[PDB]
Write a protein that binds this DNA or RNA. Structure first.
Lengths: 48, 49
RNA sequence: AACCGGAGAGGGAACCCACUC
């Protein structure tokens, strides 16, 4: 589950994203990489 | 001597020159109140300070 | 000879100093 914007608001002026949003970005980014990688390459080592 | 009545105080008063300091902790720099002013952004509670 | 107001932006993290006990 990913929380709504209220849980992780973004400030307007010093948009700087919340500490949780950056972690969400890492999660989704690596998820796409693994998804695509096991979809075609399926190399059984990089999957680990 | 009493300043209001003029009658001399029964006891004798210790009096003389002493060196006093005024500290920076004024009262006009501490007094404040609040009644529905600004609100935080994450949890919608009043600000601090 | 003829209408003619009106707002909305400042948040968080860290550190230091100080105060009342």
């Amino acid at each position: 589950p990913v929380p709504p914007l209220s849980v992780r608001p973004a400030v307007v002026m010093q948009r700087n994203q919340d500490d949780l949003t950056h972690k969400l970005a890492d999660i989704v980014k690596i998820n796409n990489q693994l998804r695509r990688n096991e979809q075609n390459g399926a190399a059984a080592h990089v999957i680990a | 001597y009493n300043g209001f009545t003029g009658r001399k105080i029964t006891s004798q008063i210790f009096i003389g020159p002493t060196y006093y300091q005024r500290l920076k902790h004024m009262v006009d720099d501490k007094i404040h109140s609040r009644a529905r002013g600004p609100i935080q952004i994450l949890n919608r509670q009043p600000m601090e300070g």
